Design a protein around this ligand. Structure first.
Ligand SMILES: CCCCCCCCCCCCCCCCCC(=O)OC[C@H](COP(=O)([O-])OCC(O)COP(=O)([O-])OC[C@@H](COC(=O)CCCCCCCCCCCCCCCCC)OC(=O)CCCCCCCCCCCCCCCCC)OC(=O)CCCCCCCCCCCCCCCCC
Ligand SMILES: CCCCCCCCCCC(CCCCCCCCCC)(CO[C@H]1O[C@@H](CO)[C@H](O[C@@H]2O[C@@H](CO)[C@H](O)[C@@H](O)[C@@H]2O)[C@@H](O)[C@@H]1O)CO[C@H]1O[C@@H](CO)[C@H](O[C@@H]2O[C@@H](CO)[C@H](O)[C@@H](O)[C@@H]2O)[C@@H](O)[C@H]1O
Ligand SMILES: CCCCC/C=C/C/C=C/C/C=C\C/C=C\CCCC(=O)O[C@H](COC(=O)CCCCCCCCCCCCCCCCC)COP(=O)(O)O[C@@H]1[C@H](O)[C@H](O)[C@@H](O)[C@H](O)[C@H]1O
Ligand SMILES: CCCCC/C=C/C/C=C/C/C=C\C/C=C\CCCC(=O)O[C@H](COC(=O)CCCCCCCCCCCCCCCCC)COP(=O)(O)O[C@@H]1[C@H](O)[C@H](O)[C@@H](O)[C@H](O)[C@H]1O
Ligand SMILES: CCCCC/C=C/C/C=C/CCCCCCCC(=O)O[C@H](COC(=O)CCCCCCCCCCCCCCC)COP(=O)([O-])OCC[N+](C)(C)C
Ligand SMILES: CCCCCCCCCCCCCCCCCC(=O)OC[C@H](COP(=O)(O)OCCN)OC(=O)CCCCCCCCCCCCCCCCC
Ligand SMILES: CCCCCCCCCCCCCCCCCC(=O)OC[C@H](COP(=O)(O)OCCN)OC(=O)CCCCCCCCCCCCCCCCC
Ligand SMILES: CCCCCCCCCCCCCCCCCC(=O)OC[C@H](COP(=O)(O)OCCN)OC(=O)CCCCCCCCCCCCCCCCC
Ligand SMILES: CCCCCCCCCCCCCCCCCC(=O)OC[C@H](COP(=O)(O)OCCN)OC(=O)CCCCCCCCCCCCCCCCC
Ligand SMILES: CCCCCCCCCCCCCCCCCC(=O)OC[C@H](COP(=O)(O)OCCN)OC(=O)CCCCCCCCCCCCCCCCC
Lengths: 81, 469, 179, 486, 90, 64, 26
């Protein structure tokens, strides 16, 4: 208990697993704007995707709300990992 | 009375020499002080939420906007004292913190453009005033032109402001194509039922919001805030936020907005987890602005949000302004000054700050526990009164994501403290020259508002009960 | 009361939507990238995004509709089971067992906490405090949610809590009276 | 004018003692000892025959922001006591000079900082027990944490940094959901108050939601098994006074907050949920006291001991019985006596001398320090539940009240008397006996100040142990208050 | 050309006081052992033994004590009892 | 009371002058006249805020 | 090494010698 439960598994839901989760997620969302040599073309193509993608989400969304929850879970998965 | 200041000022600056520039700003500082003191009494016009429309269905004057006006003047009195006063009398700090000739010109034209939004009823007044303040942020960014980073940032800010100005203009004319009207006063709550004004008013809101730093399009603003020098950036961070947000909070066009709710969730997420593994202080300090602009986008979804907004505004403005003024003072104690425009960058440079001017660390601590929301400080009642509006009105998943975002954002706030209260080998024992009395009194005043400002919470609410109800 | 779901219809609608989101994100990944890229590297150097969107869509809506149909009620637990299936699909990309178990448990808990607050990002209009009856009851009535009273009916206490612990339909005093 | 002239005199005297004496610690001891004199004179004028809140004062009202307010309309921050508050205040105030005593020669570098932070934490947890709003309870509930962060970070072991982080992190993260629940109360009732709040009834579906937000914060602060996680490291890497004020007063503050805040207006909720509390209480008594057996470090053992005793304590609170409430109070006060003495024995007499807290170095402390070994054994046996000490009165009435409400949970709750003895005597015989250790060179006997602290903290257990009736005059209202047996 | 100013004269930082002589011979083996034991969680990994203990103490034991606690709420009073009187309510 | 608001706002002014002396790495009583200056300034802000609250209460009384 | 729980602790240890457990009494 003092190793596998107290210091093992309660820290993975505690401060030792949250550090690794936030480390990975922050590394992903910082490297999201990494690749391009030019900041202007990257930001100018990033303004396009949103006003495209938000509009498509709202197209999906007024029809059925259940079929847009996994789309947002997957966008969070690709943005944060 | 900004108009008279600009008209008098640019004629006066055309005739002064370069060496006079500093003292000119001192004059303007005192000028704005006597626009607060000798002209405050106009609050007596605004009893019981009496609103005026001036220049013929063009500018709307209520007392919400009067408070925003007074807040913008107070923060300019601060920023103008930062440019117009010396830090020390060294041969160093004269070539590091030196105003240009035309700097105060663009400052007052910017405040003019930022006031003509919050006071605005029309859409072409909105568009002309956004264009005026957008030009002013273009030129305030590019005025320190002998810097590679500031010129690159001014170009980036030009193109990304041009897109989000043409998106606002497209939304205004899209609104006009379905209603022969310019006001949101025409809407009057019957029309929204029988008319699909969702996509229009939401696209208008978005094109206004992406200029703040809402999170799908947040990287370019963090780049501009890191590239600009240390004095330009405490102005261009604060002003478009409070101007554009107190426009959009005043006119309630995104209520039950699913898109604003997604973007508020996404803002609170990638602002708190964005600025975690970062080592530059303006970066770290600019993702604090992303989360605290996230807490506003919540209040856009609200009806009747004028308490939570204004209190958390003057909260964020004092806390903002104080934490930028503290790392101006830490520049004397660092062992390494690079980059003349931006002399402190890396957050490990303030490392031994408790052994050299320990009460600068007392100051830094008091302001940074207020960003977290610690209850003896003024930041907590701001987060509290946002929470009282969120839970009143049905936003239950928004509330727990707010809380998780506050907990994640406390980490890189406390990283400033972690670095500041540490051991340093070589401590200062005595300094010949000391810090400007009138300029360090401003930081002491900005702390005593944050510390002992929970006193007046009762008084303010009673005053809030009379002039807005 | 309720109405059962069409698992096949909602599943194939979500499959088409996930296919569309996969194509859009693959194109956005091409155009926001470096190196030698052409029209055919959309599904070659895709990073497997279309599998992410497709599997997450089909698994969440199939497990949500199936769990709602076998339980014959709609509440926050169906989002927990569906989010567990989504975490199973997202966690199989990392080909490890304790990873997979973590993705299932924590994604199911997060989606259950989502679906328990109403499963809505935005607000509900009739359920919030501001648009609901609040304060004290004006006269005696059925005390709805968000309302305060001074005294509650004891019959309601026996019906809601139980007939057991220290709790009775008659107070212990007048149950023991001399006549 | 009078009460302002007192402050203008006392701040001047403070400045002069600063200018002439470099330390303050004399003036801090003097001030906290005067606080004792003041609170016991308030105890003399205290009326026990009234359920009322006797000494009331409002701060930060509209009509008088700076000071006292006598108006027909009140929106400031209320303060006042009953018996139930006042007991803890007594247990608070006699602890405050002792921690100010407890580091009288340890801290050398920056004296005035450390003693100011320690006294300021003690004053905040004084005012925690005076409060009467939900918000004014909560403002001071969280005023401690910057002072605790700055105290644990600057001074401590080599691992000061992670411990100061965890005392901000977990404590904050539970207290935020506590704030959520406080907000939801304050927008339904439109009044945060410790006076009226038993009168209002909420819906069962609405009590069902509010109670989770307060209870998981009490799970964080009285560390129950899901988050009992910061407690050993924030002790094991604290300095001395931070560890004493933490384990003597902060845990009992959350034991107070489960009485003051939850049991009056969540009653009809609270009955539906006592088996969940009994799950978590039994499961934090069994599984933390079993994790004590495998420990290499020495302050960490007394930390997990504090977890096990608070796990016994809270199943008397939620017992719906007169016995359980009174037993939880006498456990809380007696553990607040006995436990900082144990943190002195590991931290003051044994870390100031050898500077290493690993258990494996320490053997045969009797033959060079007989009266320390005398202390170590009679403070060991006072911790277990060996009677005539007040710890057993708390444990016994808490186990009895927990046996009322559910007998089978009391059957496995009663084995805590065994499990609390195993690790404590397993530590005690390793410290007390054996040939004196080859690693430890012989050092000084226990000094007069340490023996002074110990003698006080042991007499004050023995008086409650021989006669627990000495403080029933405060509680006999508040033992009947929180009971809901229709 | 940008160096912090000449009027600093910064000096070294001591911690001050008395050099307390070493009352303890530290053991390398005991120190390495204890540093390995306190920081165990940064090298902890899931195996079958971890899975067994994490199943039984975090999932199976709370569920068992849960079932026992919810079944036995209002069963037993023993308060005033007699021969031939049942003590279970049910 | 009007007087306690004055004394406490002057105390806030004494706090600002103290903390502003002590950022400068000065002693506490470095320039003693500035305590009077800042105390009267922050007391004047207390005057203003108290009078505005007086008038707001008097407006609320006239609505009956 | 010799006991079963000592083998259960093996994949956790890193840069630690992993010596044979022997009783200090025997
Ligand atoms: C902030 C939120 C905080 C609240 C959660 C607390 C944290 C939980 C623990 C996290 C953790 O351990 O991660 C370690 C893990 C560490 O990464 P690693 O370095 O590769 O592995 C080293 C570990 O030691 C791995 O090696 P290992 O053998 O030691 O451990 C195996 C396993 C161990 O992790 C476990 O804890 C599993 C064991 C728990 C069993 C306990 C049972 C009893 C209870 O580790 C994992 O791989 C966990 C992956 C699952 C991450 C779950 C994220 C959930 C999304 C949260 C939404 C917000 O984190 C990650 O893998 C990061 C993955 C990328 C981030 C994903 C974020 C995307 C979110 C997408 C949206 C999801 C849906 C959202 C809801 C939608 C509707 C609103
Ligand atoms: C019923 C059976 C179900 C199957 C599960 C058992 C499971 C998951 C347990 C996680 C529990 C989650 C807890 C959540 C709680 C529930 C709410 C434990 O798998 C672990 O089992 C351990 C013991 O068997 C091993 O520990 C140590 O091993 C030796 C090292 O020196 C020592 O000799 C031993 O003494 C140690 O102990 C680990 O190596 C192994 O990873 C996974 O087993 C499976 O997964 C994979 C992934 O890793 C395993 O890895 C493979 O091994 C590489 C060569 O090894 C290969 O190159 C590679 O192809 C692959 O990576 C597989 O093998 C397989 O078995
Ligand atoms: C820059 C340069 C200028 C470029 C110009 C070229 C294009 C310009 C257009 C782009 C404009 C900018 C894009 C902005 C993002 C789009 C914003 C947007 O979706 O609002 C949607 C419109 O709901 C559609 O019905 C939207 C359906 C729209 C149809 C989708 C598109 C069809 C594609 C066909 C394939 C509404 O939001 P909302 O959350 O308040 O709406 C909710 C909710 O949806 C409703 O159920 C409620 O009743 C309502 O009260 C409200 O609560
Ligand atoms: C509702 C709340 C809204 C607003 C509240 C904010 C501020 C309060 C408003 C006004 C506060 C007015 C303060 C005026 C009186 C304050 C005051 O003692 O003088 C100054 C600072 O003076 C401002 O810095 C004057 C700067 C005023 C700008 C304040 C903006 C913040 C401090 O004296 P000081 O010993 O350092 O000044 C000495 C001395 O004057 C010289 O002779 C010596 O040569 C030199 O060594 C110097 O140190
Ligand atoms: C001789 C004139 C002196 C010049 C005064 C200039 C002040 C500029 C400063 C602006 C920002 C600072 C905050 C001012 C708060 C005014 C509250 C108010 O009253 O706000 C109310 C409602 O507020 C809100 O929604 C919430 C704002 C909450 C402020 C939170 C900060 C509290 C701590 C600072 C306040 C107490 C410090 C007093 C120190 C003795 C409406 O505003 P109002 O229309 O009643 O304006 C009053 C006209 N007054 C200025 C001439 C009197
Ligand atoms: C046919 C009709 C049916 C199909 C319609 C479905 C439409 C869904 C469109 C979603 C497409 C996915 C968005 C996307 O393309 O993201 C890619 C872009 C960059 O990501 P990438 O470079 O590829 O990966 C690097 C990882 N560090 O990432 C971006 O930066 C783009 C910004 C995000 C896109 C806007 C979405 C806003 C909503 C955020 C979700 C927040 C959820 C909160 C809960
Ligand atoms: C310090 C850190 C503090 C962290 C505190 C924990 C934060 C939350 C962690 C994640 C918890 C995930 C919760 C999963 C619950 C999912 C769910 O859907 O619950 C639904 C359940 C039923 O609610 P309902 O739909 O109204 O049906 C009524 C039937 N009696 O609703 C329920 O009955 C309540 C189930 C939740 C029980 C408490 C969970 C732990 C708190
Ligand atoms: C930083 C955190 C946020 C801070 C928020 C809270 C701010 C607290 C500021 C400290 C000031 C509070 C203590 C002084 C107020 C009480 C003084 C007083 O006069 O009490 C009045 C009360 C009744 O007096 P009255 O009704 O006028 O009739 C008298 C008839 N003989 O007489 C009495 O009943 C006796 C009252 C005894 C009060 C005992 C309080 C113990 C602690 C005293 C020191 C508090 C200083 C703490 C500083 C740290 C800040 C928390
Ligand atoms: C982050 C850390 C935050 C720290 C927070 C600490 C909050 C401290 C605020 C202190 C305000 C509370 C004052 C307690 C009241 C005690 C008192 O009564 O003082 C006397 C005077 C008012 O007295 P009066 O109203 O006439 O009632 C007496 C009836 N017998 O009261 C007065 O005249 C006021 C004198 C105190 C002024 C202090 C101003 C701040 C100092 C800096
Ligand atoms: C001839 C020209 C030269 C002489 C000038 C003569 C001018 C006449 C008026 C003088 C001003 C007196 C009125 C203001 C009182 C300020 C007194 C003072 O000097 O500051 C008080 C104290 C520091 O004073 P000091 O004893 O000198 O200590 C310095 C080294 N510790 O510092 C403090 O205590 C500040 C703490 C304030 C916090 C109070 C909060 C509660 C209210």
């Amino acid at each position: 208990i003092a190793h596998h439960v107290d210091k093992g598994s309660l820290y993975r839901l505690g401060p030792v697993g949250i550090n690794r989760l936030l480390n990975k997620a922050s590394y992903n969302v910082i490297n999201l704007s990494s690749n391009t040599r030019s900041s202007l073309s990257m930001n100018s193509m990033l303004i396009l995707i949103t006003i495209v993608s938000l509009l498509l989400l709202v197209l999906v969304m007024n029809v059925n709300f259940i079929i847009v929850i996994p789309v947002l879970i997957s966008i969070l998965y690709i943005l944060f990992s | 009375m900004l108009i008279l200041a600009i008209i008098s000022l640019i004629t006066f600056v055309s005739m002064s020499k370069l060496s006079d520039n500093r003292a000119i700003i001192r004059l303007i500082n005192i000028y704005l002080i006597l626009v607060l003191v000798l002209d405050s009494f106009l609050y007596l016009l605004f009893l019981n939420n009496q609103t005026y429309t001036v220049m013929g269905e063009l500018l709307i004057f209520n007392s919400f906007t009067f408070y925003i006006d007074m807040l913008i003047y107070f923060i300019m009195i601060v920023i103008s004292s930062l440019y117009g006063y010396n830090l020390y009398n060294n041969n160093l700090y004269k070539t590091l913190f030196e105003p240009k000739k035309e700097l105060i010109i663009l400052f007052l034209i910017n405040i003019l453009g930022a006031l003509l939004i919050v006071h605005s009823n029309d859409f072409i007044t909105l568009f002309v005033a956004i264009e005026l303040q957008s030009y002013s942020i273009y030129l305030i960014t590019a005025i320190y032109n002998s810097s590679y980073k500031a010129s690159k940032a001014s170009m980036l800010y030009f193109f990304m402001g041009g897109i989000l100005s043409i998106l606002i203009a497209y939304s205004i004319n899209t609104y006009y194509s379905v209603l022969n009207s310019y006001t949101l006063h025409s809407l009057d709550s019957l029309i929204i039922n029988t008319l699909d004004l969702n996509l229009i008013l939401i696209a208008l809101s978005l094109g206004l919001l992406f200029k703040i730093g809402i999170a799908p399009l947040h990287k370019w603003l963090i780049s501009i805030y890191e590239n600009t020098p240390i004095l330009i950036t405490i102005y261009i961070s604060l002003i478009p936020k409070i101007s554009i947000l107190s426009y959009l909070v005043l006119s309630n066009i995104s209520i039950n907005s699913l898109v604003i709710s997604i973007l508020a969730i996404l803002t609170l997420l990638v602002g708190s987890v964005g600025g975690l593994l970062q080592i530059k202080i303006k970066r770290l300090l600019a993702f604090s602005g992303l989360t605290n602009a996230g807490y506003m986008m919540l209040l856009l979804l609200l009806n009747n949000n004028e308490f939570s907004y204004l209190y958390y505004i003057t909260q964020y403005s004092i806390s903002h302004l104080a934490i930028f003024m503290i790392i101006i003072f830490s520049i004397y104690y660092i062992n390494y000054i690079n980059n003349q425009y931006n002399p402190i960058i890396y957050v490990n440079q303030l490392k031994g700050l408790i052994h050299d001017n320990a009460y600068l660390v007392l100051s830094m601590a008091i302001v940074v526990f207020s960003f977290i929301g610690i209850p003896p400080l003024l930041g907590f009642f701001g987060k509290l009164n946002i929470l009282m509006s969120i839970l009143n009105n049905g936003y239950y998943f928004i509330s727990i994501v707010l809380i998780v975002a506050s907990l994640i954002s406390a980490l890189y706030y406390l990283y400033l403290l972690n670095v500041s209260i540490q051991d340093k080998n070589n401590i200062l024992i005595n300094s010949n020259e000391t810090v400007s009395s009138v300029l360090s009194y401003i930081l002491s005043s900005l702390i005593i508002l944050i510390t002992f400002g929970f006193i007046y919470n009762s008084l303010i609410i009673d005053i809030f009960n009379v002039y807005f109800n | 009361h309720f109405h059962p779901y069409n698992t096949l219809g909602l599943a194939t609608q979500s499959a088409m939507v996930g296919l569309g989101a996969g194509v859009v994100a693959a194109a956005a990944r091409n155009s926001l990238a470096t190196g030698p890229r052409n029209i055919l590297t959309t599904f070659s150097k895709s990073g497997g995004v279309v599998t992410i969107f497709t599997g997450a869509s089909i698994a969440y809506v199939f497990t949500y509709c199936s769990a709602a149909n076998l339980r014959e009620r709609k509440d926050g637990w169906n989002h927990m089971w569906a989010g567990a299936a989504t975490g199973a699909v997202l966690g199989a990309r990392t080909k490890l067992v304790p990873a997979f178990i973590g993705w299932t448990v924590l994604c199911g808990a997060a989606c259950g906490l989502f679906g328990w607050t109403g499963a809505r990002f935005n607000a509900d209009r009739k359920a919030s405090l501001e648009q609901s009856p609040k304060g004290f009851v004006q006269e005696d009535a059925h005390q709805t949610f968000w309302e305060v009273v001074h005294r509650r009916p004891l019959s309601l206490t026996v019906e809601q809590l139980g007939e057991g612990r220290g709790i009775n339909a008659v107070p212990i005093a007048t149950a023991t009276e001399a006549p | 004018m009078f009460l302002t002239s007192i402050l203008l005199s006392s701040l001047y005297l403070f400045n002069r003692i600063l200018a002439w004496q470099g330390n303050v610690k004399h003036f801090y001891l003097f001030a906290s000892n005067l606080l004792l004199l003041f609170i016991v004179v308030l105890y003399i004028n205290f009326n026990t025959f009234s359920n009322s809140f006797q000494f009331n004062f409002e701060l930060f009202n509209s009509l008088n922001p700076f000071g006292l307010s006598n108006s027909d309309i009140s929106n400031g921050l209320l303060f006042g006591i009953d018996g139930l508050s006042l007991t803890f205040i007594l247990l608070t105030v006699l602890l405050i000079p002792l921690t100010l005593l407890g580091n009288w020669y340890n801290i050398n570098f920056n004296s005035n900082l450390y003693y100011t932070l320690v006294l300021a934490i003690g004053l905040v947890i004084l005012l925690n027990f005076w409060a009467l709003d939900y918000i004014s309870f909560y403002i001071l509930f969280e005023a401690t944490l910057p002072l605790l962060f700055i105290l644990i970070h600057i001074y401590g072991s080599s691992d000061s940094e992670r411990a100061s982080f965890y005392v901000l992190m977990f404590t904050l993260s539970g207290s935020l959901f506590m704030l959520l629940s406080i907000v939801v109360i304050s927008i339904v009732l439109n009044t945060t108050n410790f006076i009226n709040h038993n009168l209002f009834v909420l819906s069962l579906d609405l009590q069902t939601i509010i109670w989770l937000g307060l209870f998981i914060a009490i799970m964080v602060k009285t560390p129950l098994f899901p988050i009992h996680v910061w407690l050993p490291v924030v002790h094991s890497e604290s300095p001395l006074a931070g560890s004493m004020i933490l384990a003597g007063l902060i845990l009992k503050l959350a034991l107070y907050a489960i009485l003051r805040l939850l049991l009056p207006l969540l009653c009809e909720a609270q009955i539906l949920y006592t088996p969940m509390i009994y799950i978590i209480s039994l499961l934090t008594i069994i599984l933390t006291s079993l994790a004590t057996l495998r420990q290499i470090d020495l302050k960490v053992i007394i930390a997990y001991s504090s977890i096990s005793h608070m796990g016994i304590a809270i199943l008397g609170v939620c017992s719906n019985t007169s016995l359980g409430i009174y037993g939880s109070i006498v456990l809380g006060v007696a553990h607040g006596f006995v436990s900082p003495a144990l943190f002195l024995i590991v931290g003051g007499i044994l870390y100031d001398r050898y500077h290493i807290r690993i258990v494996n170095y320490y053997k045969g402390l009797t033959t060079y320090m007989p009266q320390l070994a005398t202390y170590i054994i009679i403070l060991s046996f006072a911790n277990i539940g060996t009677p005539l000490t007040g710890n057993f009165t708390g444990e016994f009435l808490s186990l009895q009240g927990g046996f009322i409400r559910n007998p089978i949970i009391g059957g496995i709750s009663c084995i805590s008397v065994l499990l609390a003895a195993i690790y404590q005597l397993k530590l005690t015989n390793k410290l007390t006996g054996g040939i004196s250790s080859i690693y430890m060179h012989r050092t000084n006997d226990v000094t007069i100040r340490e023996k002074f602290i110990m003698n006080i903290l042991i007499i004050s257990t023995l008086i409650i142990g021989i006669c627990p009736q000495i403080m029933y005059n405060l509680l006999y209202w508040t033992v009947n208050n929180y009971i809901y047996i229709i | 050309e940008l160096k912090p100013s000449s009027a600093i004269q910064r000096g070294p930082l001591n911690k001050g006081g008395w050099d307390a002589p070493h009352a303890l011979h530290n053991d390398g083996a005991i120190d390495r052992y204890a540093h390995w034991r306190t920081f165990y969680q940064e090298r902890f990994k899931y195996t079958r033994a971890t899975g067994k203990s994490t199943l039984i103490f975090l999932v199976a034991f709370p569920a068992l004590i849960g079932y026992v606690a919810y079944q036995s709420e209002g069963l037993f009073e023993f308060a005033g009892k007699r021969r031939g009187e049942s003590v279970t309510t049910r | 009371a009007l007087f306690t608001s004055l004394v406490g706002a002057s105390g806030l002014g004494f706090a600002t002058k103290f903390l502003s002396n002590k950022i400068r790495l000065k002693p506490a009583g470095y320039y003693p006249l500035g305590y009077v200056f800042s105390g009267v300034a922050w007391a004047g802000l207390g005057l203003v805020l108290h009078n505005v609250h007086q008038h707001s209460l008097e407006v609320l009384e006239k609505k009956k | 090494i010799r006991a079963s729980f000592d083998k259960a602790e093996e994949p956790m240890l890193g840069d630690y010698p992993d010596i044979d457990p022997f009783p200090a009494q025997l």
